[PDB]
Amino acid sequence: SRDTLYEAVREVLHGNQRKRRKFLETVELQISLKNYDPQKDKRFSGTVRLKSTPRPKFSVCVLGDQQHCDEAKAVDIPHMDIEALKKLNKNKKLVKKLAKKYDAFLASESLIKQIPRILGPGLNKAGKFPSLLTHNENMVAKVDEVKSTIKFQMKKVLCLAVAVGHVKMTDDELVYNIHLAVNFLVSLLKKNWQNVRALYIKSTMGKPQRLY
Amino acid sequence: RDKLNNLVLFDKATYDKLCKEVPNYKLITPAVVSERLKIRGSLARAALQELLSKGLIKLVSKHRAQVIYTRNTKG
RNA sequence: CAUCAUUCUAUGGUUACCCAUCAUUAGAGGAAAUUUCCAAUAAACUCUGGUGUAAGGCUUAGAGUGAUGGUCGAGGUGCCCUAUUUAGGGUGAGGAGCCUCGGUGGCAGCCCCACCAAAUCCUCU
RNA sequence: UAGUCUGGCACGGUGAAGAGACAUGAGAGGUGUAGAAUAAGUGGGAGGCCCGGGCCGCCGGUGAAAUACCACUACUCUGAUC
């Protein structure tokens, strides 16, 4: 279903009635669906390709040994070698903590097989998917997960929820996360039929606003 | 239908649980020692002439068919 | 010699959502009644593959190690029929599906012993 | 194949009661063990929340997941109309 109306996409400066909180926030988007079947072969899996970094904040790890040794020093990265995984993905049962401790893993180019150990299909089988790439891009190619688009999965409660913005960025990226954001999920369409009913626009915290 | 598997001579625990818990009953007949302590009537007889010799049990009345021993009294 | 768990090394393995299984589909398999036979007959349900979803070591190889040199405790598990209806009387077969160390009594707690139920039905007589 | 039997459609409408529907609007709602707490379910989330100070948590712990805090929708039952 086609939805657009970039006529006078403003009133984003109306911030200090829509916020009397103080702190680091995460701006989200929950979109309205009708008659979807998750039990049949309806593949609602993939991403909507944003350009201008909504900027998530969580723990990111890089596994390997490349030129990226020198590149990711200025990140102040949690870097980890193969010599520091023989007690990491093995100490999983008897010590009951989240023994991953960082919210991403990695497989690269030049390290074609990252880990075909019992801790290879061990790590890529328990969520926080090692899916981000660092092929030969070599301009940053680590924080470009923090400077990437957003992802979403099909499940058995049908409802969609994903973060199109954040605090601490200009308000002119939150009009740019209306241009290159929701214009694509009409082209991103199969007969998960006319999936977009209404887009309930909402910050981290506030009141029901409506742009169609 | 069911076939009982009684013991002919003592296992390590069956001598321990006879040498302790035979006077800790009140009746001692070689039919209940064969029943409870999981042994044969001949062993149940043979295991009580040596407890009369010890000073743990006490004979009441003897017969060719049935003998009735008991615990050594409080007195 | 068989078996399960646990910790360390195998130029060893798929993850832009799979793994065990809840689901389903593609495929190999029988006793007794019913005798004196012969081959029937025809299940119930059980596996590998495949897709969506939910566990995590797998499953492959080496050695130190629980605790077995032998294992689990070894028991409860049905229908029929009766004015004994918390009771009483029957006894064919061959398959899959779950609670705990019972709660009490009697020489009281152990070893017996009686009883109060755990979750069961599908069908070839 | 006439005729006849039968169903649909058109001519072809007003009104009441009632039902199963489904759009507009609602409560309560979900219990493998277990963490002390009836885990609906996701984007969460180390910070909010109340008149200078206070609770909710991370953990210990059950389990790819634990609340303060924003939303939509799964989907069982009661029940409300131009």
Side-chain angles (χ1 to χ4, degrees), chain A residues 23 26 28 30 32 155 157 161 202 205:
Chain A
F23 70 100
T26 298
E28 299 154 2
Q30 302 200 340
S32 181
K155 63 194 300 298
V157 200
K202 178 53 63 60
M205 187 188 299

PDB file of all heavy atoms in Angstrom, chain A residues 21 23 26 28 30 32 155 157 161 202 205, chain D residues 41 43 45 48-49 65 70-73, unseen atoms left out:
ATOM      1  N   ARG A  21      11.748  15.482  30.117  1.00  0.00           N
ATOM      2  CA  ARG A  21      12.830  14.565  30.578  1.00  0.00           C
ATOM      3  C   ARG A  21      14.180  15.159  30.137  1.00  0.00           C
ATOM      4  O   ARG A  21      14.166  16.250  29.530  1.00  0.00           O
ATOM      5  CB  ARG A  21      12.591  13.145  30.046  1.00  0.00           C
ATOM      6  CG  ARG A  21      11.850  12.237  31.019  1.00  0.00           C
ATOM      7  CD  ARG A  21      10.426  12.697  31.273  1.00  0.00           C
ATOM      8  NE  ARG A  21       9.552  11.593  31.634  1.00  0.00           N
ATOM      9  N   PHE A  23      17.514  12.943  29.485  1.00  0.00           N
ATOM     10  CA  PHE A  23      18.633  11.971  29.335  1.00  0.00           C
ATOM     11  C   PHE A  23      18.699  11.398  27.909  1.00  0.00           C
ATOM     12  O   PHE A  23      17.946  11.855  27.027  1.00  0.00           O
ATOM     13  CB  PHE A  23      18.507  10.875  30.399  1.00  0.00           C
ATOM     14  CG  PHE A  23      17.358   9.913  30.208  1.00  0.00           C
ATOM     15  CD1 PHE A  23      17.566   8.659  29.652  1.00  0.00           C
ATOM     16  CD2 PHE A  23      16.070  10.256  30.590  1.00  0.00           C
ATOM     17  CE1 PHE A  23      16.511   7.774  29.476  1.00  0.00           C
ATOM     18  CE2 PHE A  23      15.015   9.372  30.412  1.00  0.00           C
ATOM     19  CZ  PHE A  23      15.237   8.132  29.856  1.00  0.00           C
ATOM     20  N   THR A  26      15.897   6.942  22.912  1.00  0.00           N
ATOM     21  CA  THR A  26      15.883   6.076  21.698  1.00  0.00           C
ATOM     22  C   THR A  26      14.498   6.156  21.038  1.00  0.00           C
ATOM     23  O   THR A  26      13.545   5.584  21.608  1.00  0.00           O
ATOM     24  CB  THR A  26      16.257   4.633  22.069  1.00  0.00           C
ATOM     25  OG1 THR A  26      17.584   4.642  22.593  1.00  0.00           O
ATOM     26  CG2 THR A  26      16.174   3.670  20.905  1.00  0.00           C
ATOM     27  N   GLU A  28      11.494   5.494  18.388  1.00  0.00           N
ATOM     28  CA  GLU A  28      11.024   4.188  17.848  1.00  0.00           C
ATOM     29  C   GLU A  28       9.854   4.405  16.883  1.00  0.00           C
ATOM     30  O   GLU A  28       9.418   5.563  16.723  1.00  0.00           O
ATOM     31  CB  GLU A  28      10.642   3.266  19.006  1.00  0.00           C
ATOM     32  CG  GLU A  28      11.799   2.964  19.947  1.00  0.00           C
ATOM     33  CD  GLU A  28      11.414   2.603  21.371  1.00  0.00           C
ATOM     34  OE1 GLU A  28      10.203   2.531  21.668  1.00  0.00           O
ATOM     35  OE2 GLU A  28      12.333   2.393  22.188  1.00  0.00           O
ATOM     36  N   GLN A  30       6.307   1.897  15.625  1.00  0.00           N
ATOM     37  CA  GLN A  30       5.456   0.677  15.589  1.00  0.00           C
ATOM     38  C   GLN A  30       4.352   0.880  14.544  1.00  0.00           C
ATOM     39  O   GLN A  30       3.514   1.784  14.742  1.00  0.00           O
ATOM     40  CB  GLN A  30       4.882   0.384  16.977  1.00  0.00           C
ATOM     41  CG  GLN A  30       5.952   0.192  18.044  1.00  0.00           C
ATOM     42  CD  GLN A  30       5.453  -0.542  19.265  1.00  0.00           C
ATOM     43  OE1 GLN A  30       4.253  -0.619  19.525  1.00  0.00           O
ATOM     44  NE2 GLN A  30       6.381  -1.092  20.031  1.00  0.00           N
ATOM     45  N   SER A  32       1.218  -0.500  11.754  1.00  0.00           N
ATOM     46  CA  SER A  32      -0.058  -1.252  11.906  1.00  0.00           C
ATOM     47  C   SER A  32      -0.251  -2.238  10.745  1.00  0.00           C
ATOM     48  O   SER A  32      -0.253  -1.780   9.584  1.00  0.00           O
ATOM     49  CB  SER A  32      -1.224  -0.301  12.011  1.00  0.00           C
ATOM     50  OG  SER A  32      -2.446  -1.003  12.186  1.00  0.00           O
ATOM     51  N   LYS A 155       7.608 -12.929  13.508  1.00  0.00           N
ATOM     52  CA  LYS A 155       7.396 -13.791  14.703  1.00  0.00           C
ATOM     53  C   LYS A 155       5.889 -14.048  14.862  1.00  0.00           C
ATOM     54  O   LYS A 155       5.129 -13.660  13.949  1.00  0.00           O
ATOM     55  CB  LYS A 155       8.049 -13.136  15.926  1.00  0.00           C
ATOM     56  CG  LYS A 155       7.472 -11.788  16.341  1.00  0.00           C
ATOM     57  CD  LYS A 155       8.342 -11.033  17.329  1.00  0.00           C
ATOM     58  CE  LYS A 155       8.581 -11.785  18.623  1.00  0.00           C
ATOM     59  NZ  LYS A 155       7.320 -12.046  19.356  1.00  0.00           N
ATOM     60  N   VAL A 157       3.553 -13.032  17.078  1.00  0.00           N
ATOM     61  CA  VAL A 157       2.676 -11.960  17.643  1.00  0.00           C
ATOM     62  C   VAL A 157       2.442 -10.859  16.593  1.00  0.00           C
ATOM     63  O   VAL A 157       1.676  -9.925  16.902  1.00  0.00           O
ATOM     64  CB  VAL A 157       3.248 -11.392  18.959  1.00  0.00           C
ATOM     65  CG1 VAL A 157       2.183 -10.691  19.792  1.00  0.00           C
ATOM     66  CG2 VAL A 157       3.916 -12.475  19.795  1.00  0.00           C
ATOM     67  N   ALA A 161       8.017  -3.330  15.428  1.00  0.00           N
ATOM     68  CA  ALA A 161       8.570  -2.256  16.290  1.00  0.00           C
ATOM     69  C   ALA A 161      10.069  -2.099  16.007  1.00  0.00           C
ATOM     70  O   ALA A 161      10.797  -3.101  16.166  1.00  0.00           O
ATOM     71  CB  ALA A 161       8.316  -2.586  17.741  1.00  0.00           C
ATOM     72  N   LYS A 202       5.843   8.377  17.112  1.00  0.00           N
ATOM     73  CA  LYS A 202       6.011   8.424  18.587  1.00  0.00           C
ATOM     74  C   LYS A 202       7.507   8.464  18.912  1.00  0.00           C
ATOM     75  O   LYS A 202       8.240   7.594  18.408  1.00  0.00           O
ATOM     76  CB  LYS A 202       5.327   7.200  19.211  1.00  0.00           C
ATOM     77  CG  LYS A 202       5.432   7.063  20.726  1.00  0.00           C
ATOM     78  CD  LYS A 202       4.987   8.285  21.508  1.00  0.00           C
ATOM     79  CE  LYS A 202       3.522   8.617  21.323  1.00  0.00           C
ATOM     80  NZ  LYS A 202       2.640   7.513  21.768  1.00  0.00           N
ATOM     81  N   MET A 205       9.249   8.776  24.355  1.00  0.00           N
ATOM     82  CA  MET A 205       8.155   9.083  25.312  1.00  0.00           C
ATOM     83  C   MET A 205       7.376  10.308  24.810  1.00  0.00           C
ATOM     84  O   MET A 205       8.038  11.303  24.445  1.00  0.00           O
ATOM     85  CB  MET A 205       8.764   9.383  26.685  1.00  0.00           C
ATOM     86  CG  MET A 205       7.757   9.557  27.802  1.00  0.00           C
ATOM     87  SD  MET A 205       8.560  10.141  29.314  1.00  0.00           S
ATOM     88  CE  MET A 205       9.700   8.796  29.633  1.00  0.00           C
TER      89      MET A 205
ATOM     90  P     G D  41       5.005 -13.679  26.945  1.00  0.00           P
ATOM     91  OP1   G D  41       5.678 -14.988  26.734  1.00  0.00           O
ATOM     92  OP2   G D  41       5.482 -12.752  27.999  1.00  0.00           O
ATOM     93  O5'   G D  41       5.019 -12.815  25.613  1.00  0.00           O
ATOM     94  C5'   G D  41       5.243 -13.415  24.334  1.00  0.00           C
ATOM     95  C4'   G D  41       5.285 -12.315  23.313  1.00  0.00           C
ATOM     96  O4'   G D  41       4.088 -11.511  23.472  1.00  0.00           O
ATOM     97  C3'   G D  41       6.426 -11.327  23.502  1.00  0.00           C
ATOM     98  O3'   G D  41       7.613 -11.793  22.877  1.00  0.00           O
ATOM     99  C2'   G D  41       5.871 -10.069  22.850  1.00  0.00           C
ATOM    100  O2'   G D  41       6.002 -10.049  21.444  1.00  0.00           O
ATOM    101  C1'   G D  41       4.399 -10.150  23.250  1.00  0.00           C
ATOM    102  N9    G D  41       4.097  -9.394  24.460  1.00  0.00           N
ATOM    103  C8    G D  41       4.102  -9.822  25.766  1.00  0.00           C
ATOM    104  N7    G D  41       3.797  -8.878  26.616  1.00  0.00           N
ATOM    105  C5    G D  41       3.591  -7.757  25.823  1.00  0.00           C
ATOM    106  C6    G D  41       3.237  -6.426  26.177  1.00  0.00           C
ATOM    107  O6    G D  41       3.026  -5.952  27.302  1.00  0.00           O
ATOM    108  N1    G D  41       3.131  -5.614  25.054  1.00  0.00           N
ATOM    109  C2    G D  41       3.337  -6.023  23.757  1.00  0.00           C
ATOM    110  N2    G D  41       3.190  -5.094  22.805  1.00  0.00           N
ATOM    111  N3    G D  41       3.672  -7.253  23.418  1.00  0.00           N
ATOM    112  C4    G D  41       3.779  -8.060  24.491  1.00  0.00           C
ATOM    113  P     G D  43      12.609  -6.446  20.131  1.00  0.00           P
ATOM    114  OP1   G D  43      13.885  -7.089  19.722  1.00  0.00           O
ATOM    115  OP2   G D  43      12.482  -5.890  21.503  1.00  0.00           O
ATOM    116  O5'   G D  43      12.246  -5.285  19.097  1.00  0.00           O
ATOM    117  C5'   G D  43      13.252  -4.556  18.356  1.00  0.00           C
ATOM    118  C4'   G D  43      13.325  -3.104  18.790  1.00  0.00           C
ATOM    119  O4'   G D  43      11.992  -2.520  18.859  1.00  0.00           O
ATOM    120  C3'   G D  43      13.934  -2.832  20.159  1.00  0.00           C
ATOM    121  O3'   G D  43      15.361  -2.794  20.117  1.00  0.00           O
ATOM    122  C2'   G D  43      13.338  -1.472  20.499  1.00  0.00           C
ATOM    123  O2'   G D  43      13.990  -0.378  19.884  1.00  0.00           O
ATOM    124  C1'   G D  43      11.915  -1.629  19.963  1.00  0.00           C
ATOM    125  N9    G D  43      10.993  -2.192  20.946  1.00  0.00           N
ATOM    126  C8    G D  43      10.424  -3.442  20.920  1.00  0.00           C
ATOM    127  N7    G D  43       9.645  -3.673  21.940  1.00  0.00           N
ATOM    128  C5    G D  43       9.704  -2.507  22.689  1.00  0.00           C
ATOM    129  C6    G D  43       9.063  -2.165  23.909  1.00  0.00           C
ATOM    130  O6    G D  43       8.290  -2.847  24.592  1.00  0.00           O
ATOM    131  N1    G D  43       9.398  -0.879  24.320  1.00  0.00           N
ATOM    132  C2    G D  43      10.243  -0.030  23.647  1.00  0.00           C
ATOM    133  N2    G D  43      10.445   1.174  24.208  1.00  0.00           N
ATOM    134  N3    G D  43      10.848  -0.337  22.509  1.00  0.00           N
ATOM    135  C4    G D  43      10.532  -1.581  22.090  1.00  0.00           C
ATOM    136  P     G D  45      17.068   1.238  24.805  1.00  0.00           P
ATOM    137  OP1   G D  45      16.606   2.630  24.572  1.00  0.00           O
ATOM    138  OP2   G D  45      18.277   0.739  24.101  1.00  0.00           O
ATOM    139  O5'   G D  45      17.273   1.018  26.369  1.00  0.00           O
ATOM    140  C5'   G D  45      16.751   1.955  27.330  1.00  0.00           C
ATOM    141  C4'   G D  45      16.924   1.422  28.733  1.00  0.00           C
ATOM    142  O4'   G D  45      16.131   0.217  28.911  1.00  0.00           O
ATOM    143  C3'   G D  45      18.330   0.997  29.121  1.00  0.00           C
ATOM    144  O3'   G D  45      19.118   2.137  29.460  1.00  0.00           O
ATOM    145  C2'   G D  45      18.056   0.066  30.295  1.00  0.00           C
ATOM    146  O2'   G D  45      17.805   0.777  31.488  1.00  0.00           O
ATOM    147  C1'   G D  45      16.780  -0.646  29.831  1.00  0.00           C
ATOM    148  N9    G D  45      16.969  -1.947  29.190  1.00  0.00           N
ATOM    149  C8    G D  45      18.099  -2.418  28.565  1.00  0.00           C
ATOM    150  N7    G D  45      17.955  -3.625  28.089  1.00  0.00           N
ATOM    151  C5    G D  45      16.652  -3.972  28.417  1.00  0.00           C
ATOM    152  C6    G D  45      15.924  -5.165  28.161  1.00  0.00           C
ATOM    153  O6    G D  45      16.301  -6.187  27.573  1.00  0.00           O
ATOM    154  N1    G D  45      14.630  -5.095  28.668  1.00  0.00           N
ATOM    155  C2    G D  45      14.101  -4.016  29.335  1.00  0.00           C
ATOM    156  N2    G D  45      12.831  -4.137  29.750  1.00  0.00           N
ATOM    157  N3    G D  45      14.769  -2.899  29.581  1.00  0.00           N
ATOM    158  C4    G D  45      16.030  -2.947  29.099  1.00  0.00           C
ATOM    159  P     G D  48      17.428   9.704  34.302  1.00  0.00           P
ATOM    160  OP1   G D  48      17.506  10.916  33.452  1.00  0.00           O
ATOM    161  OP2   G D  48      18.340   9.580  35.469  1.00  0.00           O
ATOM    162  O5'   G D  48      15.929   9.560  34.831  1.00  0.00           O
ATOM    163  C5'   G D  48      14.779  10.028  34.090  1.00  0.00           C
ATOM    164  C4'   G D  48      13.801   8.897  33.840  1.00  0.00           C
ATOM    165  O4'   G D  48      14.441   7.623  34.134  1.00  0.00           O
ATOM    166  C3'   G D  48      12.515   8.926  34.661  1.00  0.00           C
ATOM    167  O3'   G D  48      11.466   9.612  33.978  1.00  0.00           O
ATOM    168  C2'   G D  48      12.199   7.445  34.845  1.00  0.00           C
ATOM    169  O2'   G D  48      11.489   6.867  33.767  1.00  0.00           O
ATOM    170  C1'   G D  48      13.598   6.840  34.957  1.00  0.00           C
ATOM    171  N9    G D  48      14.169   6.794  36.303  1.00  0.00           N
ATOM    172  C8    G D  48      15.422   7.216  36.678  1.00  0.00           C
ATOM    173  N7    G D  48      15.673   7.023  37.943  1.00  0.00           N
ATOM    174  C5    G D  48      14.519   6.428  38.434  1.00  0.00           C
ATOM    175  C6    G D  48      14.202   5.990  39.745  1.00  0.00           C
ATOM    176  O6    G D  48      14.900   6.039  40.764  1.00  0.00           O
ATOM    177  N1    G D  48      12.923   5.443  39.807  1.00  0.00           N
ATOM    178  C2    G D  48      12.060   5.333  38.744  1.00  0.00           C
ATOM    179  N2    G D  48      10.869   4.773  39.004  1.00  0.00           N
ATOM    180  N3    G D  48      12.347   5.731  37.513  1.00  0.00           N
ATOM    181  C4    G D  48      13.584   6.270  37.433  1.00  0.00           C
ATOM    182  P     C D  49      10.172  10.134  34.780  1.00  0.00           P
ATOM    183  OP1   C D  49       9.119  10.466  33.790  1.00  0.00           O
ATOM    184  OP2   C D  49      10.615  11.166  35.751  1.00  0.00           O
ATOM    185  O5'   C D  49       9.684   8.839  35.573  1.00  0.00           O
ATOM    186  C5'   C D  49       8.306   8.647  35.950  1.00  0.00           C
ATOM    187  C4'   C D  49       8.189   8.229  37.400  1.00  0.00           C
ATOM    188  O4'   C D  49       9.395   7.545  37.844  1.00  0.00           O
ATOM    189  C3'   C D  49       8.018   9.353  38.409  1.00  0.00           C
ATOM    190  O3'   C D  49       6.683   9.861  38.435  1.00  0.00           O
ATOM    191  C2'   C D  49       8.426   8.654  39.699  1.00  0.00           C
ATOM    192  O2'   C D  49       7.420   7.831  40.253  1.00  0.00           O
ATOM    193  C1'   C D  49       9.621   7.831  39.219  1.00  0.00           C
ATOM    194  N1    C D  49      10.907   8.547  39.359  1.00  0.00           N
ATOM    195  C2    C D  49      11.506   8.608  40.622  1.00  0.00           C
ATOM    196  O2    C D  49      10.948   8.050  41.579  1.00  0.00           O
ATOM    197  N3    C D  49      12.676   9.276  40.769  1.00  0.00           N
ATOM    198  C4    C D  49      13.242   9.870  39.716  1.00  0.00           C
ATOM    199  N4    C D  49      14.395  10.515  39.906  1.00  0.00           N
ATOM    200  C5    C D  49      12.650   9.829  38.420  1.00  0.00           C
ATOM    201  C6    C D  49      11.492   9.168  38.289  1.00  0.00           C
ATOM    202  P     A D  65      18.692 -15.020  27.900  1.00  0.00           P
ATOM    203  OP1   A D  65      20.004 -14.337  28.015  1.00  0.00           O
ATOM    204  OP2   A D  65      18.103 -15.683  29.093  1.00  0.00           O
ATOM    205  O5'   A D  65      17.642 -13.970  27.323  1.00  0.00           O
ATOM    206  C5'   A D  65      17.540 -12.639  27.874  1.00  0.00           C
ATOM    207  C4'   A D  65      16.133 -12.100  27.724  1.00  0.00           C
ATOM    208  O4'   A D  65      15.313 -13.064  27.010  1.00  0.00           O
ATOM    209  C3'   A D  65      15.382 -11.840  29.027  1.00  0.00           C
ATOM    210  O3'   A D  65      15.708 -10.572  29.594  1.00  0.00           O
ATOM    211  C2'   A D  65      13.925 -11.959  28.595  1.00  0.00           C
ATOM    212  O2'   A D  65      13.384 -10.773  28.048  1.00  0.00           O
ATOM    213  C1'   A D  65      14.002 -13.072  27.546  1.00  0.00           C
ATOM    214  N9    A D  65      13.727 -14.408  28.079  1.00  0.00           N
ATOM    215  C8    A D  65      14.562 -15.224  28.802  1.00  0.00           C
ATOM    216  N7    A D  65      14.021 -16.368  29.141  1.00  0.00           N
ATOM    217  C5    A D  65      12.745 -16.307  28.601  1.00  0.00           C
ATOM    218  C6    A D  65      11.668 -17.213  28.606  1.00  0.00           C
ATOM    219  N6    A D  65      11.709 -18.409  29.198  1.00  0.00           N
ATOM    220  N1    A D  65      10.531 -16.843  27.973  1.00  0.00           N
ATOM    221  C2    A D  65      10.490 -15.642  27.379  1.00  0.00           C
ATOM    222  N3    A D  65      11.435 -14.705  27.306  1.00  0.00           N
ATOM    223  C4    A D  65      12.550 -15.104  27.943  1.00  0.00           C
ATOM    224  P     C D  70       6.290   6.900  30.376  1.00  0.00           P
ATOM    225  OP1   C D  70       6.210   8.381  30.393  1.00  0.00           O
ATOM    226  OP2   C D  70       5.208   6.111  31.019  1.00  0.00           O
ATOM    227  O5'   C D  70       6.451   6.410  28.869  1.00  0.00           O
ATOM    228  C5'   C D  70       5.310   6.028  28.083  1.00  0.00           C
ATOM    229  C4'   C D  70       5.675   5.995  26.618  1.00  0.00           C
ATOM    230  O4'   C D  70       6.842   5.147  26.417  1.00  0.00           O
ATOM    231  C3'   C D  70       4.614   5.426  25.689  1.00  0.00           C
ATOM    232  O3'   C D  70       3.644   6.405  25.325  1.00  0.00           O
ATOM    233  C2'   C D  70       5.454   4.937  24.517  1.00  0.00           C
ATOM    234  O2'   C D  70       5.852   5.953  23.620  1.00  0.00           O
ATOM    235  C1'   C D  70       6.671   4.366  25.244  1.00  0.00           C
ATOM    236  N1    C D  70       6.518   2.947  25.629  1.00  0.00           N
ATOM    237  C2    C D  70       6.567   1.967  24.628  1.00  0.00           C
ATOM    238  O2    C D  70       6.737   2.318  23.451  1.00  0.00           O
ATOM    239  N3    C D  70       6.427   0.665  24.971  1.00  0.00           N
ATOM    240  C4    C D  70       6.243   0.327  26.251  1.00  0.00           C
ATOM    241  N4    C D  70       6.116  -0.969  26.544  1.00  0.00           N
ATOM    242  C5    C D  70       6.192   1.304  27.288  1.00  0.00           C
ATOM    243  C6    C D  70       6.331   2.589  26.936  1.00  0.00           C
ATOM    244  P     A D  71       2.140   5.958  25.000  1.00  0.00           P
ATOM    245  OP1   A D  71       1.459   7.100  24.337  1.00  0.00           O
ATOM    246  OP2   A D  71       1.557   5.378  26.237  1.00  0.00           O
ATOM    247  O5'   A D  71       2.347   4.775  23.951  1.00  0.00           O
ATOM    248  C5'   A D  71       1.415   4.522  22.881  1.00  0.00           C
ATOM    249  C4'   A D  71       2.086   3.737  21.775  1.00  0.00           C
ATOM    250  O4'   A D  71       3.288   3.099  22.287  1.00  0.00           O
ATOM    251  C3'   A D  71       1.251   2.618  21.153  1.00  0.00           C
ATOM    252  O3'   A D  71       0.554   3.105  20.008  1.00  0.00           O
ATOM    253  C2'   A D  71       2.301   1.583  20.761  1.00  0.00           C
ATOM    254  O2'   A D  71       2.894   1.794  19.495  1.00  0.00           O
ATOM    255  C1'   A D  71       3.326   1.746  21.880  1.00  0.00           C
ATOM    256  N9    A D  71       3.084   0.907  23.053  1.00  0.00           N
ATOM    257  C8    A D  71       2.296   1.170  24.147  1.00  0.00           C
ATOM    258  N7    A D  71       2.305   0.216  25.046  1.00  0.00           N
ATOM    259  C5    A D  71       3.159  -0.738  24.510  1.00  0.00           C
ATOM    260  C6    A D  71       3.586  -1.992  24.977  1.00  0.00           C
ATOM    261  N6    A D  71       3.206  -2.512  26.147  1.00  0.00           N
ATOM    262  N1    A D  71       4.448  -2.691  24.202  1.00  0.00           N
ATOM    263  C2    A D  71       4.839  -2.155  23.035  1.00  0.00           C
ATOM    264  N3    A D  71       4.499  -0.992  22.488  1.00  0.00           N
ATOM    265  C4    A D  71       3.647  -0.324  23.284  1.00  0.00           C
ATOM    266  P     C D  72      -1.026   2.956  19.918  1.00  0.00           P
ATOM    267  OP1   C D  72      -1.616   4.318  19.956  1.00  0.00           O
ATOM    268  OP2   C D  72      -1.451   1.939  20.915  1.00  0.00           O
ATOM    269  O5'   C D  72      -1.246   2.356  18.459  1.00  0.00           O
ATOM    270  C5'   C D  72      -1.918   1.098  18.280  1.00  0.00           C
ATOM    271  C4'   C D  72      -0.971   0.087  17.687  1.00  0.00           C
ATOM    272  O4'   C D  72       0.318   0.165  18.357  1.00  0.00           O
ATOM    273  C3'   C D  72      -1.389  -1.370  17.829  1.00  0.00           C
ATOM    274  O3'   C D  72      -2.429  -1.765  16.940  1.00  0.00           O
ATOM    275  C2'   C D  72      -0.048  -2.091  17.752  1.00  0.00           C
ATOM    276  O2'   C D  72       0.539  -2.326  16.488  1.00  0.00           O
ATOM    277  C1'   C D  72       0.831  -1.143  18.562  1.00  0.00           C
ATOM    278  N1    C D  72       0.737  -1.455  19.989  1.00  0.00           N
ATOM    279  C2    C D  72       1.500  -2.509  20.492  1.00  0.00           C
ATOM    280  O2    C D  72       2.264  -3.114  19.725  1.00  0.00           O
ATOM    281  N3    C D  72       1.402  -2.830  21.800  1.00  0.00           N
ATOM    282  C4    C D  72       0.569  -2.154  22.593  1.00  0.00           C
ATOM    283  N4    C D  72       0.504  -2.506  23.879  1.00  0.00           N
ATOM    284  C5    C D  72      -0.235  -1.084  22.103  1.00  0.00           C
ATOM    285  C6    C D  72      -0.131  -0.782  20.803  1.00  0.00           C
ATOM    286  P     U D  73      -2.186  -1.810  15.362  1.00  0.00           P
ATOM    287  OP1   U D  73      -0.943  -1.066  15.049  1.00  0.00           O
ATOM    288  OP2   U D  73      -3.453  -1.439  14.682  1.00  0.00           O
ATOM    289  O5'   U D  73      -1.919  -3.357  15.092  1.00  0.00           O
ATOM    290  C5'   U D  73      -2.851  -4.367  15.528  1.00  0.00           C
ATOM    291  C4'   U D  73      -2.100  -5.538  16.111  1.00  0.00           C
ATOM    292  O4'   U D  73      -1.255  -5.082  17.200  1.00  0.00           O
ATOM    293  C3'   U D  73      -2.956  -6.622  16.742  1.00  0.00           C
ATOM    294  O3'   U D  73      -3.495  -7.525  15.778  1.00  0.00           O
ATOM    295  C2'   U D  73      -1.968  -7.294  17.687  1.00  0.00           C
ATOM    296  O2'   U D  73      -1.167  -8.306  17.109  1.00  0.00           O
ATOM    297  C1'   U D  73      -1.137  -6.105  18.174  1.00  0.00           C
ATOM    298  N1    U D  73      -1.593  -5.593  19.479  1.00  0.00           N
ATOM    299  C2    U D  73      -1.196  -6.285  20.611  1.00  0.00           C
ATOM    300  O2    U D  73      -0.478  -7.270  20.569  1.00  0.00           O
ATOM    301  N3    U D  73      -1.667  -5.774  21.795  1.00  0.00           N
ATOM    302  C4    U D  73      -2.482  -4.674  21.966  1.00  0.00           C
ATOM    303  O4    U D  73      -2.819  -4.338  23.102  1.00  0.00           O
ATOM    304  C5    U D  73      -2.859  -4.019  20.749  1.00  0.00           C
ATOM    305  C6    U D  73      -2.420  -4.494  19.576  1.00  0.00           C
TER     306        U D  73
END
